[PDB]
């Protein structure tokens, strides 16, 4: 194999994996209508880089790869078959990566991305140099992925459309498992049970899957795994179990109590339960690889993160955005999912008691608004102030009752928060700057445009311009 051409290089999952390959020294070909930081990257190392579907990309390519995101329609697909080359999903790319690796497989609905993030600076401090590939920026890296020098290979395995069913790893981790809708037809949720239960089968028998026995589906599917478990969590019959913790600023304390090992102090540089809950998954699995307790304690205290998860921007003086004195805390979170938000919500109440939580959200697509419409609401309302922009689309026709403007009316119809609807992208700063004031911590919260709204008031230390 010597040329991989990639639809859609440009997004997080595909650059990664073109990244790795070209260090590999693999020819390497791309296409994106939105040239970005990682399309800019790939270029630098070599890869040739369209920012247009047209079929004459697909030239000379030994395979094409593809998102879930690109229709069947693009033009570079139809041109790939007429030539009768092989067309691959991301998925099974990252599955020929790990083919002959030590492969380390995060799953789960909630703390994948930061759960691989952990591992990988597990496994870099203990020299273990590992591949890893991950769903978001590591800011250790500066990357979403990196070629190691060791055969391990950590990576984030995704279940959307069952994707990680193409994956044969050695080590698997499940954080979590929880639907984000309820079931359009009988079986909806027990088939997507049964697709995390297919993917820990997809481990070889001396193989080993960690998995997080708080979460009440995984507790009930354990029995339904025919391999060697390791659980974590709080739960009192958890195989590696968290206790005594208590949240300081941005920090987790805790100990971490382990078969056939005296029990750990542990500091961790990353707020919340749910972030104990991801590290200890980490220590599971770094444990039975034989990882010493001084390289792992290294590496917690040092973490350093994900883009956009609980993501500390700044604090930036209030004088120049509104006249006010004082300082306010920008902290950015992609967080899309009613859990997700409470999370976050959670982390931030816990670690700075006294400031006061601003949010501008942005919901992800009318499905999910309407889907887990209730959940929204409540979730919303523990915040002291509320900035909502309207629902991000992402190519979704509208769904009456289910925007931002009907949340807002079911969130003020309880009397305790006035929401404040921003009616535009552009708008967002100027409405943000009028309300704060010091002493706000302020959570730029969604997975949409949002994210640039955050790198935006971020760049401009929350001044509008
Ligand atoms: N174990 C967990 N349980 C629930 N939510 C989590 C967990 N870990 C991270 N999160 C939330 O999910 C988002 C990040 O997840 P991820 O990108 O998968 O690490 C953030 O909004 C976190 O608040």
């Given at each position: 194999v010597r040329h991989i051409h990639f639809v859609?290089?440009?997004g997080a999952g595909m650059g990664g994996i073109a990244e790795v390959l070209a260090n590999e020294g693999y020819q390497i070909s791309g296409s994106d209508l939105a040239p970005n930081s990682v399309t800019q990257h790939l270029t630098a190392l070599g890869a040739q880089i369209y920012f247009h579907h047209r079929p004459?990309?697909?030239?000379?390519?030994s395979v094409v790869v593809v998102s879930t995101?690109?229709?069947?329609?693009?033009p570079e697909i139809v041109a790939a078959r007429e030539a009768r080359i092989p067309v691959i999903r991301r998925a099974e790319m990252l599955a020929e990566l790990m083919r002959y690796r030590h492969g380390i497989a995060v799953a789960g609905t909630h703390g994948k991305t930061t759960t691989t993030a952990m591992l990988s600076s597990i496994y870099a401090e203990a020299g273990l140099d590992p591949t890893f590939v991950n769903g978001g920026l590591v800011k250790a890296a500066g990357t979403h992925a990196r070629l190691g020098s060791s055969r391990y290979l950590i990576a984030e395995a995704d279940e959307s459309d069952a994707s990680f069913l193409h994956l044969q790893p050695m080590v698997a981790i499940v954080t979590n498992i929880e639907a984000d809708?309820?079931?359009?037809?009988?079986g909806d949720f027990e088939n997507l049970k049964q697709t995390f239960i297919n993917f820990l089968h997809?481990?070889?028998?001396?193989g080993r899957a960690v998995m997080c026995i708080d979460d009440p589906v995984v507790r009930e599917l354990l029995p339904r795994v025919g391999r060697h478990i390791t659980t974590y969590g709080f739960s009192d019959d958890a195989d590696v179990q968290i206790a005594s913790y208590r949240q300081e600023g941005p920090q987790g304390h805790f100990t971490l109590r382990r078969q056939d090992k005296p029990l750990i102090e542990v500091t961790l540089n990353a707020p919340g339960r749910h972030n104990a809950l991801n590290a200890a998954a980490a220590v599971a699995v770094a444990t039975e690889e034989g990882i010493e307790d001084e390289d792992i304690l290294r590496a917690l205290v040092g973490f350093q993160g994900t883009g956009r998860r609980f993501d500390f921007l700044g604090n930036f003086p209030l004088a120049p955005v509104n006249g006010k004195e004082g300082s306010a805390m920008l902290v950015d979170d992609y967080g899309h999912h009613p859990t997700e938000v409470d999370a976050t919500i959670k982390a931030a109440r816990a670690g700075w008691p006294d400031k006061r939580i601003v949010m501008l959200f942005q919901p992800h697509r009318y499905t999910r608004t309407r889907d887990l419409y209730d959940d929204f609401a409540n979730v919303l309302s523990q915040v002291d102030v509320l900035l909502m922009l309207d629902?991000?689309?992402?190519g979704e026709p509208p769904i009456p009752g289910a925007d931002s403007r009907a949340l807002c009316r079911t969130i003020r119809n309880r009397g305790k928060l006035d929401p404040i609807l921003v009616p535009d992208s552009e708008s967002a700063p100027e409405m943000l700057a009028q309300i704060l004031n010091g002493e706000d911590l302020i959570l730029v919260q969604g997975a949409g445009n949002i994210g640039k709204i955050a790198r935006k008031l971020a760049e401009h230390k929350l001044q509008p311009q």
């Amino acid at each position: 194999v010597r040329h991989i051409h990639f639809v859609g290089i440009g997004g997080a999952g595909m650059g990664g994996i073109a990244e790795v390959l070209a260090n590999e020294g693999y020819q390497i070909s791309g296409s994106d209508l939105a040239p970005n930081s990682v399309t800019q990257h790939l270029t630098a190392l070599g890869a040739q880089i369209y920012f247009h579907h047209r079929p004459e990309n697909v030239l000379d390519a030994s395979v094409v790869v593809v998102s879930t995101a690109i229709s069947a329609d693009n033009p570079e697909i139809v041109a790939a078959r007429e030539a009768r080359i092989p067309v691959i999903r991301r998925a099974e790319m990252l599955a020929e990566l790990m083919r002959y690796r030590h492969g380390i497989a995060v799953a789960g609905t909630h703390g994948k991305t930061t759960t691989t993030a952990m591992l990988s600076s597990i496994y870099a401090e203990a020299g273990l140099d590992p591949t890893f590939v991950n769903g978001g920026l590591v800011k250790a890296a500066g990357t979403h992925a990196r070629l190691g020098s060791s055969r391990y290979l950590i990576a984030e395995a995704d279940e959307s459309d069952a994707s990680f069913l193409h994956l044969q790893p050695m080590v698997a981790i499940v954080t979590n498992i929880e639907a984000d809708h309820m079931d359009t037809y009988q079986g909806d949720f027990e088939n997507l049970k049964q697709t995390f239960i297919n993917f820990l089968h997809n481990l070889p028998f001396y193989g080993r899957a960690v998995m997080c026995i708080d979460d009440p589906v995984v507790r009930e599917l354990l029995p339904r795994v025919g391999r060697h478990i390791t659980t974590y969590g709080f739960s009192d019959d958890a195989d590696v179990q968290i206790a005594s913790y208590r949240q300081e600023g941005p920090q987790g304390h805790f100990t971490l109590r382990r078969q056939d090992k005296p029990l750990i102090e542990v500091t961790l540089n990353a707020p919340g339960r749910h972030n104990a809950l991801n590290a200890a998954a980490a220590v599971a699995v770094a444990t039975e690889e034989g990882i010493e307790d001084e390289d792992i304690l290294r590496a917690l205290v040092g973490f350093q993160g994900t883009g956009r998860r609980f993501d500390f921007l700044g604090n930036f003086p209030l004088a120049p955005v509104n006249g006010k004195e004082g300082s306010a805390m920008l902290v950015d979170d992609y967080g899309h999912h009613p859990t997700e938000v409470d999370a976050t919500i959670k982390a931030a109440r816990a670690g700075w008691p006294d400031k006061r939580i601003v949010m501008l959200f942005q919901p992800h697509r009318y499905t999910r608004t309407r889907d887990l419409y209730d959940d929204f609401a409540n979730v919303l309302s523990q915040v002291d102030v509320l900035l909502m922009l309207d629902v991000y689309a992402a190519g979704e026709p509208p769904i009456p009752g289910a925007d931002s403007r009907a949340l807002c009316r079911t969130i003020r119809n309880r009397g305790k928060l006035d929401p404040i609807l921003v009616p535009d992208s552009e708008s967002a700063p100027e409405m943000l700057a009028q309300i704060l004031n010091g002493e706000d911590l302020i959570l730029v919260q969604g997975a949409g445009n949002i994210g640039k709204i955050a790198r935006k008031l971020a760049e401009h230390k929350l001044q509008p311009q």
